[PDB]
Amino acid sequence: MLPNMRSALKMFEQSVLLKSVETIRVDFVDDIIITATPIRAVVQVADKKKLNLDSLDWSKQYIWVHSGSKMEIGQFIEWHGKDFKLVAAGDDYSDYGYNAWYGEETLKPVLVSS
């Protein structure tokens, strides 16, 4: 019997939107439909969000979510005001009943429907 952290994930839940992009192109012109779903999750900070140095300073908040629902990389997660690309340090205890990912705020505005 595979251990299932699922029940150990409900208490800490939070509502959040999980979107994915399925890019569409004709004659090499970019359009992006969206797929958004209300999914369960839990959020903690992932890399303490610092200020990098460049020609202009920039900063991207990091969150790392858990959920009972599967989360592929090429998906975004919005919880407060800015979606996070599910890019890094993710791991799928799918057979153990959940999965986790870090998150990168796409400083672009949130993909509502396009």
């Binding site: 192109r25 004709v26 004659d27 090499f28 990389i73 090429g74």
Partner: protein, 159 residues
Amino acid sequence: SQSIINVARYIRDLLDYDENLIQFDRKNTQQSDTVTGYIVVNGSGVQNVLSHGSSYDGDAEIMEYSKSESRLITLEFYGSDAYENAELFSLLNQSQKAKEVSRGLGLTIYNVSQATDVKQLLGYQYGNRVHVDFNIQYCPSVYVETLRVDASEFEILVD
């Protein structure tokens, strides 16, 4: 602007090759299923200008600021059939098909300069990846509504 997309067009229908399988460059795009031989028009090479034209039109009176330039755009082929899509491109580049399909793509096309089978470190594995080089030369333009001079009144003086 449009130049990289144009060379992407040219490689799109020189190899008779797919839309969704040509991605541009160092953008964000996932390369899933390594064997799906992709082609990417790497434009990271510095584009350097050559001249800055300036033409002027009389009747439908506006003028025309042009800027000829060139960039060493490289092509990276991926996938199990990378080698072929390299060579078969690196050799059809100077045929009828290419030189006949790049009609309106306001973009010259020079010979393929060099190739390389530099693969990519796909994490304890090697995925086929080949670069081919060729300088590409084009010229963006813009049009501006200036206005002509119809006459010139003036006065002279003398000792």
